[PDB]
Amino acid sequence: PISPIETVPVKLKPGMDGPKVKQWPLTEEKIKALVEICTEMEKEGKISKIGPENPYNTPVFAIKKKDSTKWRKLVDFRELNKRTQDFWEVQLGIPHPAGLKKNKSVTVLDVGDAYFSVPLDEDFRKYTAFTIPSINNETPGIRYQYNVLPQGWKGSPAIFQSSMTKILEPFRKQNPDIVIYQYMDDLYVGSDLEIGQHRTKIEELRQHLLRWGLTTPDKKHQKEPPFLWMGYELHPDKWTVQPIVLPEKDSWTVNDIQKLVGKLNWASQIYPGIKVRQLCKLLRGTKALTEVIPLTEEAELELAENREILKEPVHGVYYDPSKDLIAEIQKQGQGQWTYQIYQEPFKNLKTGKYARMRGAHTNDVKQLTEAVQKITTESIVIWGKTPKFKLPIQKETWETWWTEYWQATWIPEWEFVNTPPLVKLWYQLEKEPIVGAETFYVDGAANRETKLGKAGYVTNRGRQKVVTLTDTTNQKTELQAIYLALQDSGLEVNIVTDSQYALGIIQAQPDQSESELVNQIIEQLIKKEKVYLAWVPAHKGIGGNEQVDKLV
Amino acid sequence: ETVPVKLKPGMDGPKVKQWPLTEEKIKALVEICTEMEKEGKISKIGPENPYNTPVFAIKKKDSTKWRKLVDFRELNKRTQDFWEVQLGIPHPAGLKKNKSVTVLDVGDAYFSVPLDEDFRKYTAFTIPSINNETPGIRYQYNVLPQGWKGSPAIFQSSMTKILEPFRKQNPDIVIYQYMDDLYVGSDLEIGQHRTKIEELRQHLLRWGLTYELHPDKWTVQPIVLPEKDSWTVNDIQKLVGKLNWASQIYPGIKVRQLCKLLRGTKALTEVIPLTEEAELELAENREILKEPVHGVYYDPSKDLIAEIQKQGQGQWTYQIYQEPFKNLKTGKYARHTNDVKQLTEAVQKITTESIVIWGKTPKFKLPIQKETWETWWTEYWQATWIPEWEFVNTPPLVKLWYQL
Ligand SMILES: Cc1cc(/C=C/C#N)cc(C)c1Nc1ccnc(Nc2ccc(C#N)cc2)n1
């Protein structure tokens, strides 16, 4: 059928007009196939023969479908498409299972010839006119234009999805407890009624559907849940990711490790505590897809962990709207966070992981906060509601980190949970200078051409030291010089520096860094008992600024 | 009648994806919008419209009523020729000198003029559904939308017509329009002021229209120099950096006589005396900072920037400028609460002052993680415009060179 629905007006982009592409000549039998096809289609309304006053043309080919010897008609809308207006993005964003409400009975119905079942806008049909070439191309070809939405045209998925929504509107409104999902030419029908009441409202959906040009699989064939969908396995009561088998190989290529890292990542939606840091380490570097990568001990270890985590099945529950979401996060490794989301412990609606580093340096507190944000947004999308959090951090630790920290921040209602490791701050810098502690006016420097550097310090107690570094930058020397001061000083030290770069880093109280230097400065800072870091304006001519500026 | 409206040469409509909204705001939005539609203010639209701007709900202030709010930042940017350099609303340089300024919402007026039909497709927005389970509801505007800088521009004609008599009858009263808001100021005693507002709303009320600023009581936050009994080397080093930075702003700032005392390698904790030359150079700057930056002027062709530091204990400093360090204005703002709530309030505060003073919204450098701000700001937002913002870590030094 051709749905009786109204059409969507469409126009070519503002500059241009329809394509005018010459038809490549086709073998004598490809020509035969196209004629058979278009005669079929023509009798259905899908296409219409046209007088060659119509300027427009688009190429058309016919690939010999499968070994099953039938033919299929392909059209090339490359050019009409390039010249057609942009449409509202079909659906961008996809429903997560964990967001679905539980349902008693579910049915799939598939639309037939979906695209050819929806009308095309009159004023636009003209531009969809193709040509079936004559044998050895000696005479005028037959010419049709589309009446329905052609496959492969730019606006087809948009208009179709829209039409199907316009047609469903009535049913949905007169039945707000039954659930439909439209994914492309699929309709799934969800109900909390019994196998009879449900086949009932299903069968009059179909009736409503045929009243509008759309035919559906008879109540006799052929799909019952479980359903595979977008990678998932939905049952009426629970869901999971669809079966994922991890290979047993003695040799692992880059390509084999990618597909594994991506199957594990997929798994991690519902399988708690999946880790992949060690398998992803391999991929670092530049190597060919076929190059074999030998697994490290830590990576082989990980593969081990993951392999058992998967050995027994796991499923997620569905969402009861009248209960709070609970989100628990655990530290799982360095920069690695895992979380579960549930409503009755511990039957999870979903699990996840987080391992993004922001910047070169952070500490656990920063990272844990960034996962709370991640999880929160995710919550809003999936459930339209933020969860209540349980975090491995004491209220005091987090109250301390924030108040003193210079970026604004705020996490939703949360409460402590004792799930080790716990997040702490590993050192804290003095607020005022320390009486009775040696004062290091330190100072690093680099000659930008040589990239040769000299780092050093002088103290109020007469001490001095200047050492030499090779191919570093001003940045490194300034961090070296502070590192210097920390290894030579005792447990209470005052350090003065003219490096704002360095102050900023350290004042941020890092506890992980990409920089080895910094990771040491850190080691040192945890060993100390009091440390006060001060900044001074370089070259301005300051107490020990100029003094050890002599030494550099 | 409808004023023919067009984008800028080049640019196309806006295509901004809808931010995820909560069940609360969506529900709210679905009401609002089905009522706006069975009133012909907005119409349901097809896929043949590729354009989007983001919408969301607030409840204004202490009010238990949701209000639709549409983020027209992109569209405004993409029409910008029209709403500024053809028709445009002139900014009274006196409004900022007034004893009292009242801000009242005249957005609804727009709802009654029709919008150029060949422009409506650019005002499309989407009501999203939770978990993307169904297709969002899509709408265009038929009338002049709130939030869009076309609307006051299109209504300039009808607005001054409406205020004509009241202006005649109180020639000493200032009324300036910016987007959906009217700014009304005067020097009357607060009571005679408020009375003149009710008189004004009566005028408005004949055409459809059912807080207090005190711009004088706006004064600068000087860079404050600590006054002290003793001084440690540390205390003076602190001092010298802070004067050191002010020099990158205020002409005349001297430093030499002070960093005089930081000689050689002393202990930070070492109390060191205070000589007469320094005691004098100290006071000298003190009055310079007191004063407006000599040399700086507002350029009408240039974006305003505003920057905010977190001070802790509910304090927030901020500065306004067009080229960095050349500060047009500096200030503080202080103190149910919440780091983000405060900032969002501070933003609105600074934005308000910024409109009164220059007729222009600043572009904010926000000291917060992008993703955190986005999740939450729409929760404390009670304004009907939205400034532009970008996020940035605050260099540690700046924070304190501005502390009070
Ligand atoms: C998004 C979505 C995907 C599928 C995808 C189907 C497929 N393949 C099927 C449906 C019916 C829906 N729509 C909704 C909306 C609200 N609750 C539910 N719950 C729900 C859906 C399917 C099963 C099952 N089995 C259980 C509960 N589904």
Tab-separated table of C-alpha atoms in Angstrom, chain A residues 8-9 85-88 91-97 99-101 158-159 162 165-166 172 180-182 319 356 358 369-370 373 376-377 380-386 402-412 433-436 439 441 458-462 494-496 500 503-504 507 532-537 540-544 547, chain B residues 12 15-18 20-24 44-52 126 129-136 138 232-234 237-238 240-241 244 247 255-256 259 262-270 309-313 316 337-340 343 366-373 375-376 380 392-399 401:
chain	number	residue	atom	x	y	z
A	8	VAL	CA	6.231	16.131	3.953
A	9	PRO	CA	7.234	19.054	1.702
A	85	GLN	CA	17.954	19.848	2.182
A	86	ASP	CA	19.108	18.719	5.612
A	87	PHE	CA	16.440	17.092	7.804
A	88	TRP	CA	15.816	16.769	11.515
A	91	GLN	CA	16.541	9.750	16.352
A	92	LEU	CA	19.898	10.637	17.849
A	93	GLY	CA	20.206	9.149	21.277
A	94	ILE	CA	19.164	5.565	21.996
A	95	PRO	CA	17.198	4.022	24.834
A	96	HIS	CA	19.188	2.113	27.418
A	97	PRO	CA	17.596	-1.107	28.693
A	99	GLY	CA	15.813	2.714	31.700
A	100	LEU	CA	12.962	0.500	30.514
A	101	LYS	CA	10.062	-0.264	32.794
A	158	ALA	CA	13.416	11.159	8.542
A	159	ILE	CA	10.053	11.364	6.715
A	162	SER	CA	7.917	11.002	11.224
A	165	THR	CA	4.866	8.708	14.586
A	166	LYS	CA	2.015	10.741	13.111
A	172	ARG	CA	-0.592	5.817	21.869
A	180	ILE	CA	5.561	1.118	21.457
A	181	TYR	CA	9.114	1.601	20.365
A	182	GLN	CA	9.904	2.603	16.828
A	319	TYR	CA	13.375	0.602	36.454
A	356	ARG	CA	39.349	9.277	32.089
A	358	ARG	CA	41.551	15.227	33.127
A	369	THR	CA	34.106	13.964	41.621
A	370	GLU	CA	34.394	13.721	37.850
A	373	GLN	CA	29.338	14.051	37.295
A	376	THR	CA	24.802	11.978	37.233
A	377	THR	CA	24.413	13.106	33.615
A	380	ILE	CA	19.460	12.216	33.879
A	381	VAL	CA	19.456	10.748	30.399
A	382	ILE	CA	18.380	7.281	31.370
A	383	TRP	CA	15.961	7.982	34.240
A	384	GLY	CA	15.420	11.739	34.272
A	385	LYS	CA	16.522	11.813	37.899
A	386	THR	CA	19.830	11.973	39.811
A	402	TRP	CA	36.569	21.549	48.348
A	403	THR	CA	36.560	24.517	50.702
A	404	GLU	CA	40.281	25.104	50.171
A	405	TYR	CA	40.161	24.285	46.448
A	406	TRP	CA	39.733	27.144	43.996
A	407	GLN	CA	37.352	25.641	41.443
A	408	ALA	CA	33.672	25.742	42.344
A	409	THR	CA	32.159	22.290	42.786
A	410	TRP	CA	29.139	20.407	44.126
A	411	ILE	CA	27.967	16.810	44.299
A	412	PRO	CA	24.341	15.672	44.863
A	433	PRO	CA	55.129	29.935	56.697
A	434	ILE	CA	56.863	27.724	59.238
A	435	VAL	CA	58.945	29.322	61.948
A	436	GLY	CA	62.158	27.453	62.657
A	439	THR	CA	63.876	28.548	53.932
A	441	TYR	CA	64.807	30.141	47.806
A	458	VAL	CA	70.100	28.937	48.601
A	459	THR	CA	68.842	28.912	52.180
A	460	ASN	CA	68.647	31.329	55.069
A	461	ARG	CA	71.127	28.941	56.708
A	462	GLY	CA	73.847	29.450	54.102
A	494	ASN	CA	59.775	26.540	53.588
A	495	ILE	CA	60.203	26.746	49.806
A	496	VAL	CA	60.091	30.037	47.914
A	500	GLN	CA	53.855	30.072	38.989
A	503	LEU	CA	53.221	26.535	42.329
A	504	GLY	CA	49.976	25.892	40.511
A	507	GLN	CA	49.231	23.887	45.160
A	532	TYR	CA	55.081	25.738	52.971
A	533	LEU	CA	55.330	26.858	49.354
A	534	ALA	CA	55.461	30.573	48.521
A	535	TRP	CA	55.624	32.414	45.227
A	536	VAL	CA	57.602	35.521	44.440
A	537	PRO	CA	57.865	37.715	41.301
A	540	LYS	CA	61.764	41.820	40.275
A	541	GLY	CA	64.769	41.689	42.570
A	542	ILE	CA	63.713	39.769	45.645
A	543	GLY	CA	65.507	38.606	48.790
A	544	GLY	CA	66.804	35.198	47.816
A	547	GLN	CA	70.659	35.561	45.182
B	12	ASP	CA	22.379	29.111	8.375
B	15	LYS	CA	21.296	23.300	15.080
B	16	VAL	CA	21.863	22.853	18.770
B	17	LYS	CA	20.991	19.535	20.334
B	18	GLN	CA	18.654	19.531	23.323
B	20	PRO	CA	18.917	16.139	28.731
B	21	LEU	CA	16.134	17.362	31.031
B	22	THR	CA	14.569	15.870	34.146
B	23	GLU	CA	11.139	14.280	34.353
B	24	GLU	CA	10.120	17.362	36.332
B	44	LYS	CA	4.021	21.398	15.779
B	45	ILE	CA	6.481	20.904	12.961
B	46	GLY	CA	7.777	18.226	10.625
B	47	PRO	CA	11.214	16.659	9.937
B	48	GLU	CA	11.594	19.097	7.048
B	49	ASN	CA	12.924	21.530	9.668
B	50	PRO	CA	16.606	20.740	10.460
B	51	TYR	CA	17.016	23.507	13.092
B	52	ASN	CA	17.113	23.362	16.898
B	126	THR	CA	12.542	20.044	20.904
B	129	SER	CA	11.787	12.328	26.332
B	130	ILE	CA	13.391	10.355	29.075
B	131	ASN	CA	15.747	7.592	27.937
B	132	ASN	CA	14.989	8.624	24.370
B	133	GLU	CA	12.095	6.156	24.473
B	134	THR	CA	9.896	8.212	22.128
B	135	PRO	CA	10.463	11.010	19.571
B	136	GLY	CA	10.751	14.439	21.094
B	138	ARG	CA	8.984	19.574	17.944
B	232	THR	CA	57.461	39.106	58.188
B	233	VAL	CA	59.561	38.653	55.098
B	234	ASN	CA	56.767	36.408	53.854
B	237	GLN	CA	56.920	39.109	49.662
B	238	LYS	CA	53.139	38.635	49.510
B	240	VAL	CA	55.444	42.912	46.650
B	241	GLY	CA	53.903	40.399	44.283
B	244	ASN	CA	53.858	43.930	41.329
B	247	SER	CA	51.451	47.775	38.073
B	255	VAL	CA	57.509	48.968	44.286
B	256	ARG	CA	61.236	49.568	44.625
B	259	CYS	CA	61.227	45.071	48.010
B	262	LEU	CA	63.804	41.677	51.062
B	263	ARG	CA	67.592	41.576	50.941
B	264	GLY	CA	69.574	38.354	50.877
B	265	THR	CA	68.334	35.010	52.133
B	266	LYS	CA	66.209	35.637	55.232
B	267	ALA	CA	63.842	33.199	56.957
B	268	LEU	CA	60.238	33.651	55.800
B	269	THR	CA	59.109	33.973	59.406
B	270	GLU	CA	61.639	36.760	60.082
B	309	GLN	CA	37.472	33.737	41.406
B	310	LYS	CA	36.339	31.532	44.260
B	311	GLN	CA	37.474	32.945	47.596
B	312	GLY	CA	35.896	30.353	49.862
B	313	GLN	CA	33.618	31.038	52.822
B	316	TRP	CA	33.521	35.642	45.164
B	337	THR	CA	23.604	27.039	49.610
B	338	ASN	CA	26.006	25.451	47.384
B	339	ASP	CA	29.170	26.335	45.440
B	340	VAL	CA	27.358	26.252	42.098
B	343	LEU	CA	28.242	31.258	41.122
B	366	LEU	CA	33.668	30.448	34.853
B	367	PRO	CA	36.002	28.835	37.483
B	368	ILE	CA	34.340	25.433	37.331
B	369	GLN	CA	34.489	22.132	35.473
B	370	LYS	CA	32.421	22.463	32.287
B	371	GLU	CA	30.417	19.332	32.908
B	372	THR	CA	29.531	20.238	36.495
B	373	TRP	CA	28.223	23.672	35.526
B	375	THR	CA	24.483	19.602	34.948
B	376	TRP	CA	23.431	22.187	37.533
B	380	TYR	CA	19.391	28.113	40.146
B	392	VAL	CA	38.721	27.880	32.999
B	393	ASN	CA	40.979	27.037	35.920
B	394	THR	CA	41.917	30.166	37.869
B	395	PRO	CA	45.647	30.781	38.087
B	396	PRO	CA	46.359	30.546	41.856
B	397	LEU	CA	48.077	33.912	42.058
B	398	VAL	CA	45.198	35.977	40.593
B	399	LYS	CA	42.772	34.525	43.152
B	401	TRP	CA	45.806	39.425	44.232
